[PDB]
Curated annotation (Swiss-Prot), chain B:
GO MF terms held by the record: 3'-5'-RNA exonuclease activity; magnesium ion binding; polyribonucleotide nucleotidyltransferase activity; RNA binding
Protein name: Polyribonucleotide nucleotidyltransferase
Function comment: Involved in mRNA degradation. Catalyzes the phosphorolysis of single-stranded polyribonucleotides processively in the 3'- to 5'-direction. Is a global regulator of virulence and persistency.
Similarity-based family: Belongs to the polyribonucleotide nucleotidyltransferase family.
GO biological process: mRNA catabolic process; RNA catabolic process; RNA processing
GO cellular component terms given for this protein: cytosol
Cofactor dependency: Mg(2+)
Gene: pnp
Keyword Cytoplasm on entry: yes
EC number from the UniProt entry: 2.7.7.8
UniProt-annotated binding residues for Mg(2+): 486, 492
Location of this chain's protein in the cell: Cytoplasm
Reactions this protein catalyses: RNA(n+1) + phosphate = RNA(n) + a ribonucleoside 5'-diphosphate
Organism, scientific name: Salmonella typhimurium (strain LT2 / SGSC1412 / ATCC 700720)
Length: 55, 546, 545, 545
């Protein structure tokens, strides 16, 4: 239904440091099959010609 | 009772009717053109007074296809014609290209041409009717239009030229050329061919120019009987004394700036010559605004370049008239795309990709002339950083749409038939650098990416953008025109094709005097340029990937 | 010829390749970044001259996704990628948040960063790759930019932090946190969690900042070998004269005007000081632009407010650092909606509705990672009248996308599983008033409306927007920050969650020196604020209707 | 901490609730109006300072419909409502038309009204609720506004008037009329009838106006209790001296120039008189600006035309009050359309086409009230060249959507029933010339095109737009009003119908004193004009093809 509250100071609650939970889980390795790289350096076939006057 | 003025004439195998004086009488001119049941209402409104401080001609051409013309209700969710489609934008540029150069220098009044398709005979294409209607309306308006233009579509059936082939004839035709011109000169050529020779394409341009003279004559008669009185427009006064002052001050300096062989140094020196001249002139007389002096210096720089080129001197980048810029071809640049290539020609670069899909991926276009299934898709993106500028991305300007259709036309001639490659192919071009013709680098990159993707194409295709500069009898053909040499294009043409024929030809002539021999010399220099590019392309990849 | 500069480094379980020098050579900088087959081409163009009379920094980040990257043809009617999707706008906002504060103060030249995805590995998300590419392009450009940034996505699987979790691993994960920062400080944290503690969420921010340093070092080596000469840009020197002038004439008056309690009286007197000081100076300074004097005054004012807050004095509304504004909670406010609620915090009010539909009504998104169906929809509307202004309605460009994703991220953790509630839920939030964080009022209203609609949620969630102001080793954490105290946010953070955990955390730091202890104190005061808001919300509705 | 002021009253068979004071407290005013579970939230924001250069009043009305109001998730691809629909733009004009004439003259401060539908009872239409919420929000805001307006929808069932007919009752009703007015005068009428008389259509306006008084009285009580204090807006003083000087210089000359019976010669001499008065005044006083004197001249010209019309002098084109412009009817113009017609009335001309399709081609509209299949589509296109200007092409404004809905309303009464004609019909009208009312030319062209296409329509329909000029006791009813006589229309009304009844009636009164006896004379003249146009039309097509 309905509820309201005035302007109230909500103080920070008492802080208890947390012990970090520990696990021996081993993250499996990532298997990647591919070239891995993009850009010109990865080109499978390349050709060039300087500025020339068509014969 | 409304009195319509109707003029009928025979255009090839069709009858064209021009009707004026009844439909839109509050517009500067209005004409209803019909060719064998395909009708386009074309209107022209020209503002009589130019807005103060206008620098460029503001001409707008809007082409609309109305679904009811085909006796059909629109199939969109709102069942109403929406924003201009690609086809409509392209037909609007096909109309805009021939007419823009025919308004006189200094005409900066606003002109809007609106062509609306109101009836369609499935066999008669509305684009030629719309161009004829725009020519008739512009000539009837009394606006300073420098002459009626005509238009024709030429096909190549049984080794013969045919005028305005119907869609059925066009299915068996090896050529689809649209030529537009005046009584004296060809002004526009947008074409697509199945690897035809240069002589065939030039004969087709001549044939269409010869056959559109009946349209030109009929428009002249209509103007002689129903044309409005001509406009009392005079170009703004040219300051001969100021032009002489600026020339005598900066012309020989800029000439010398250009006679040095370093691009960055030159650019600097040039700017210097300017800043110095403008400061000195405004100090002598503060009345003259800076901007006008800057425009006059820019124009003097353009004339200096033009005269250096015409005199046989090297171009702005040190190249001779027939030299192509440096070429780098790389295929396989992207890891997870079916096919990819990077094509660099000097300072113009394109990253082109090819993707293979299934028959469900073909685009179904419901066009005014019928439903059509497109298994080959071409998309061209021209990002702002291609030119070192900031701007808006995604939004495709109209030229960028026209450049993607020109590249698709260039590549379409070598795509395999559906019984040998029943797959859907999408080719996406990304212009990464642009100092020249990005559409032709898109053609070469599309060919490389299609070969990389394993699509069996008939042959590799490349394109070349050329330009012809003419002063009287003297002319020079320039290969691989630069983006800064756009002012030197009395005739700017773009030829695409393979080692054995032409697949796409676009021409935009703005001057008069270009004979057929001149077109022989220009298309022979473009053949040499394209064959050189094709050799460099073949040295990388020569056959589709297994 | 074309000679590419390629640098490869190991980032966790992936290899990152940075290539520059051969593509888009007419742009200020351009880099192709590839991580395990996911490749993004990022280009930065900066204009060399500033538009005369420019006040704000024009920075645009455009993120584009290409369907050909995934080997697919677009499914739209035109078979072409179109206007930015909501995901593209959100990733571009995640590239803009960490870079904008790293440009020098005064720099107002126009900069556009365009990142285009060109290849995608269904397992590797292109967003961190695009962030690495933006950092590299902005560090190779020479444009005044204060540091290579890194980027990392942390996940939490089997009570362990995992760097850049893959799409398969992000299913069993309890966290999806993105942390970007420089070598010295964290600058941005965007996260979504399944009700985790404040210590698990901060340990994640630390883990990802420590792990992104290899990216920072790689970009610093690439810049050492291929960077463009640094721009010779200098900030316009301050008119120290006009400044100290305006000070002498208005500082003490404003410092006393701010001791006034009544809002209306305070606002009036300030304009009296503002107008009077303007003329009483303009008289001798002949023609001095007004806008300029108004700026100098705003500066003075904001500095008075800062000094007061840092000195321990009441805030501009009379509140103390830990006080939350008045709360009003109503449910069932609309007759024919499945669920509705009105949430009011001070002067920020949100009208939130929840609608139930069939599995069919669920949104099908075709994404680069793969086709995906979303059964929970969150739509946020920020109308122009919320701030008492006129404007264009229906344009979700008032940061509605970002604020609607932060609210969705706040409510997703408590949403029921599909095998308990196999219905499509659409939550629409209307921001009726705004003078604070509306994104967090939307989280509390979404929780109330979902309980009203009968949706069985795991727990009620609420959110609070906080801020931290620091001057040296002195700092104050302010709860329920108002829209006026935006300038007081050296660290502006927003934390949503339930009574037993955080469900979303957004942080945007603009300064340096915020350690882990400071963030712990800041997020402990944000716990006290949520638990108060949550107790007020539970007094209205405790269980779904 | 929040307390809303709620007032309930009985409006016919419904209970209307007005709620203010709780939601959207940063807007100038906000009201939630509920009519039997149909709730619309309406907000108004007015800027308290006028822009420095402002000639027109910047009023914007935005009406948005939210799908959650009907308990449904939107069927759009993005599961959001993004673009305003046609019905939304037409409800915004129904709200805009009655209120714009009620803001004081010279008031040019920007005002935005936003009406959002937040709950829908499928049987109570949200448009009347939106109009009542806009009247309440504008009367509570304090913004200079003249009186609360009310609204009512009347229907004709069993030869009796029904107030606010429900969606079911509207199936059996022969009328659908919306009347909005103040306490003393009707201001807006929009209606669609099934070929009813003029007495039956004026009785409904009088009934709806007498029934809306409970709404105006409840809004007045709500404003009395919760209204904000009226603004201190004073109209800018008129330059009485400059006025009288321009009047002495040019009034006689223009009054004599207008007795010329040639359009071009009169226009040239008027331009001369204007230029000369301007030049001379500028020579006398160098401070005078051109646009102010030009506007004073234009106002003097309008007053001259009004005085000539009210004295019985011929109109600006030589016609008397009861003469209709020359008519030209042409059928079968387009070669391949199913039906086509060109209709010309003087300088207004419309090319209309009709296309027949199958049942499947009918438009499906997913609306808040419920899904609706429309087998009759009417599309209206007003190109820039119709008035001889250049502009954007392809984008319909808010008028080109209301002018098309008015023409659809005028043609809808004669459309054949589904059993007799089981086809989908689309009528597209292109306005080729505009010097008057293009909507009524669209009505006549739609009728001629429908007969040309073979659609078995019940009877031929035609429309006439007319105006009424009033000065005290003296009034003149002008038939076939021109596009340059718009200033002369104290009451502007467009009547469409057949030879035996009215199919649509739109009125827009901007003065007070228009009693039903003056409306009977106006509608009788409109009937005579429409029968003349229908006689001319019948001499061509005569019957369906």
């Amino acid at each position: 239904n309905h509820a309201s509250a005035p302007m109230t100071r909500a103080p920070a609650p008492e802080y208890v440091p947390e012990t970090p939970h520990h696990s021996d889980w081993q993250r499996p390795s990532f298997h990647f099959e591919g070239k891995g790289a993009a850009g010109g350096h990865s080109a499978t076939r390349h050709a060039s010609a300087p500025a020339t006057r068509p014969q | 009772m409304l009195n319509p003025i109707v003029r009928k004439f025979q255009y090839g195998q069709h009858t064209v009717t021009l009707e004026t004086g009844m439909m839109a009488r509050q517009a500067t001119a209005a004409v209803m053109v019909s060719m064998d049941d395909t009708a386009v209402f074309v209107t022209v409104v020209g503002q009589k007074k130019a807005k103060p401080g206008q620098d460029f001609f503001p001409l707008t051409v809007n082409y609309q296809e109305r679904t009811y013309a085909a006796g059909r209700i629109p199939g969109s969710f709102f069942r109403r014609e929406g924003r201009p489609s690609e086809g409509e934008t392209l037909i609007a540029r096909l109309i805009d290209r021939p007419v823009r150069p025919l308004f006189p220098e200094g005409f900066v009044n606003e002109v809007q041409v609106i062509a609306t398709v109101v009836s369609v005979n499935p066999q008669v294409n509305p684009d030629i009717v719309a161009m004829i209607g725009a020519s008739a309306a512009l000539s009837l308006s009394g606006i300073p239009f420098n002459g009626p233009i005509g238009a024709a579509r030429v096909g190549y059936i049984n080794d013969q030229y045919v005028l305005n082939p119907t869609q059925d004839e066009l299915k068996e035709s090896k050529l689809d050329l649209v030529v537009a011109g005046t009584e004296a000169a060809v002004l526009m050529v947008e074409s697509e061919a199945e690897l035809l020779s240069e002589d065939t394409m030039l004969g087709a341009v001549v044939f269409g120019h010869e056959q559109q003279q009946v349209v030109i004559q009929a428009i002249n008669d209509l103007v002689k009987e129903a044309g409005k009185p001509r406009w009392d427009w005079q170009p703004e006064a040219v300051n001969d004394a100021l032009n002489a002052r600026v020339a005598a001050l900066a012309e020989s300096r800029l000439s010398d700036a250009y006679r040095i062989t370093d691009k960055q140094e030159r650019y600097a020196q040039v700017d210097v010559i300017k800043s110095e001249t403008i400061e000195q002139l405004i100090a002598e007389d503060e009345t003259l605004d800076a901007n006008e002096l800057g425009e006059i210096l820019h124009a003097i720089e353009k004339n200096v370049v033009r005269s250096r080129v015409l005199a046989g001197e090297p171009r702005i980048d040190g190249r001779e008239k027939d030299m192509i810029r440096g070429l780098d071809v790389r295929t396989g640049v992207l890891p997870r795309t079916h096919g990819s290539a990077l094509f660099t020609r000097g300072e113009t670069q394109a990253l082109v990709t090819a993707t293979l899909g299934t028959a469900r991926d073909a685009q179904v276009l419901d066009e005014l002339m019928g439903e059509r299934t497109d298994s080959f898709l071409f998309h061209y993106n021209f990002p702002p950083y291609s030119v070192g500028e900031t701007g808006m991305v995604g939004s495709p300007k109209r030229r960028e749409i026209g450049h993607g259709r020109l590249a698709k036309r260039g590549v379409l001639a070598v795509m395999p038939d559906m019984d040998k490659f029943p797959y859907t192919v999408r080719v996406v071009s990304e212009i990464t650098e642009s100092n020249g013709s990005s559409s032709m680098a898109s053609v070469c990159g599309a060919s490389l990416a299609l070969m990389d993707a394993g699509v069996p194409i008939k042959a590799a295709v490349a394109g070349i953008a050329m330009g012809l500069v003419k002063e009287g009898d003297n002319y020079v053909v320039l290969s691989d025109i630069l983006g800064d040499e756009d002012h030197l294009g009395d005739m700017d043409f773009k030829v695409a094709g393979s080692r054995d024929g032409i697949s796409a030809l676009q021409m935009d002539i703005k001057i008069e005097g270009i004979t057929k021999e001149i077109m022989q010399v220009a298309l022979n220099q473009a053949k040499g340029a394209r064959l050189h590019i094709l050799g460099v392309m073949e040295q990388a990849i020569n056959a589709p990937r297994g």
